[PDB]
Write an enzyme that holds these catalytic residues in place. Structure first.
Site, short mmCIF file in Angstrom:
data_model
loop_
_atom_site.label_atom_id
_atom_site.label_comp_id
_atom_site.label_asym_id
_atom_site.label_seq_id
_atom_site.Cartn_x
_atom_site.Cartn_y
_atom_site.Cartn_z
N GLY A 37 0.36 -1.48 -0.02
CA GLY A 37 0.15 0.10 -0.43
C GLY A 37 0.21 1.19 0.07
O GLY A 37 1.43 1.36 -0.71
N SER A 38 0.34 2.18 0.54
CA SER A 38 1.14 3.60 0.82
C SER A 38 2.39 3.73 0.38
O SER A 38 3.11 4.67 0.78
CB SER A 38 0.59 4.24 1.65
OG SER A 38 -0.72 4.36 1.94
N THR A 39 2.90 2.62 1.59
CA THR A 39 4.42 2.60 1.91
C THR A 39 5.51 2.01 0.43
O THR A 39 6.92 2.71 0.13
CB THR A 39 5.08 1.24 3.02
OG1 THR A 39 5.12 0.42 1.75
CG2 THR A 39 4.48 1.60 4.62
N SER A 84 -1.75 10.24 1.96
CA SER A 84 -2.49 9.23 1.32
C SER A 84 -2.97 9.29 0.62
O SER A 84 -3.90 7.50 0.63
CB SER A 84 -2.07 7.63 2.80
OG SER A 84 -1.80 6.81 1.74
#
EC number: 3.4.16.4
Length: 481
Positions: A231-233, A287
């Site tokens: 995901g957002s990482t 995000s």
């Protein structure tokens, strides 16, 4: 004339400071030729009692194996209680002097170090991965019924692990799991300049000295085996491509109103939908999937895919560990809008915590990738400039903002230092992990760290990053920025 093998002393494993992590202890293993034991049946009850084995079961064994002129009795008694059987002095009994492993740090470093089998062979972790370095070469002895060959001992292996950072990692991830009633977790700490893994801890752990009634869940090296959608990482990598395209700079604005974006049949939805204009830092702080999707449509998936492959995502780590999963960075000729978007906000691939930490290392090391190592690095390899120092620098500043700025992850701030990083909510039916990935100090990075907490969102992982980074930097005498 026959031959018996002289077991070799397995090489000493230490941490990077020479703290012993795995040590070959002397034991004594007892065999017997039944044929000769058959002549002293009146000694059996005493022999049995001194082997813990039951009297009739013991005599059953010897009697049926009467024809044989060799069997073990018991492996791996202390040499001192082991002499206690040779103190009975019973015909048919001869002894081999063996070694087996002790793990002085026990559960703290169980997964990284691993353990040996009954034959003193590597079965998990480094013990497996460096089996050949550590085992050396059995010697050879002519038995009549001289020494043909001297035993060559396994060589000492100094891990990249710093046991002080490992103790800290282990403690803090343990606390957090119970604080958040979570089932499992991983924490990786990397030296961004050298590619060294300074700490790798998984929960649950186990005592490798006491593997009796061991649950297979406890043994799972999660950091290297569990794969998940980051995901957002991985949005910082999407942004690295955006800033390398020539078409984007940090003060550029994207309209993410109304927090959704229809692309044909598919609808991209943001986790918070209270925005119109955001700058590129805002896209990360919020995000916004819509934000990062629109940029990706402008630059092309190809450019994002390429940065992600170059920082090792869905790639082989080259660590040669037994069960290591590689994950999947999927490729296309033609990237439609859906696949482009989901790659860019990090549902379009699956990775391990070690891969994510390695990618964060590259970014933190002003865009230079260095190969991962679980062994002490004395001579740093040249490593590859995969992102431009200038872009890396910009994305560092943006992630420092994600941590510092109001709206930002305040719980990841490291008291003493400026930290940088990104939370995400991972997907392994739809299993969900809380992720935090970052480095510090923000302006001159030294350490990259990933925190994974299974089924505790990503504000869960952040406080752990905070406390573990604070400790790790102090332990490494990194000067407060």
């Amino acid at each position: 004339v026959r031959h018996i093998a002289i077991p070799a002393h397995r090489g000493l494993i230490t941490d990077r400071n020479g703290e012993p992590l795995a040590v070959s202890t002397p034991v004594t293993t007892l065999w017997a030729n039944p044929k000769e034991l058959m002549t002293a049946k009146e000694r059996w009850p005493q022999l049995a009692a001194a082997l813990g084995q039951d009297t009739k079961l013991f005599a059953d064994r010897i009697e049926q194996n009467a024809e044989r002129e060799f069997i073990y009795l018991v492996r791996g008694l202390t040499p001192e209680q082991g002499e206690g059987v040779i103190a009975l002095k019973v015909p048919g009994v001869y002894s081999i002097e063996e070694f087996r492993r002790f793990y002085p740090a026990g559960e703290v470093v169980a997964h990284a170090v691993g353990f040996t089998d009954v034959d003193d062979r590597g079965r998990e972790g480094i013990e497996l991965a460096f089996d050949e370095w550590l085992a050396g070469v059995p010697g050879k002895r002519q038995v009549l019924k001289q020494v043909t060959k001297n035993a060559k001992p396994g060589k000492t292996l100094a891990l990249s692990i710093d046991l002080r950072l490992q103790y800290l990692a282990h403690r803090e991830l343990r606390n957090a799991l119970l604080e958040n009633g979570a089932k499992a977790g991983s924490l990786v700490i990397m030296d961004v300049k050298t590619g060294e893994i300074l700490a790798m801890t998984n929960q649950p752990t186990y005592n490798p000295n006491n593997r009796r009634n061991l649950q297979p869940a406890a043994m799972r090296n999660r950091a290297m085996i569990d794969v998940f959608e980051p995901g957002s990482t991985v949005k910082p990598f999407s942004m690295s491509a955006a800033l390398a395209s020539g078409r984007w700079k940090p003060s550029d604005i994207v309209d993410v109103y109304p927090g959704t974006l229809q692309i044909g049949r598919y609808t991209i939805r943001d986790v918070s939908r209270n925005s119109r204009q955001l700058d590129l830092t805002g896209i990360l702080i919020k995000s916004s999937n819509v934000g990062i999707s629109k940029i990706a449509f402008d630059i092309g998936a190809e450019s994002i895919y390429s940065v992600m492959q170059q920082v090792g995502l869905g790639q082989d780590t080259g660590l040669g560990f037994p069960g290591e999963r590689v994950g999947n960075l999927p490729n296309h000729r033609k990237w439609p809008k859906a696949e482009t978007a989901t790659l860019a906000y990090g549902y379009g691939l699956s990775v391990t915590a070690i891969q994510l930490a390695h990618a964060y290392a590259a970014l933190a090391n002003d865009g230079k990738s260095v190969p991962l190592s679980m062994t002490r690095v004395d001579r740093v390899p040249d490593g590859v400039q995969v992102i431009s120092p200038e872009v890396a620098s910009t994305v560092q500043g943006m992630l420092q903002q994600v941590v510092e700025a109001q709206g930002g992850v305040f719980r990841a701030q490291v008291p003493g230092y400026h930290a940088a990083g990104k939370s995400g909510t991972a997907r392994k039916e739809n299993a969900y992990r809380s992720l935090f990935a970052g480095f510090a100090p923000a302006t001159d990075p030294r350490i990259a760290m990933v925190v994974v907490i299974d089924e505790p969102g990503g504000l869960v992982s952040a406080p752990v990053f905070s406390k573990v980074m604070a400790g790790a930097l102090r332990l490494m005498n990194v000067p407060p920025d």
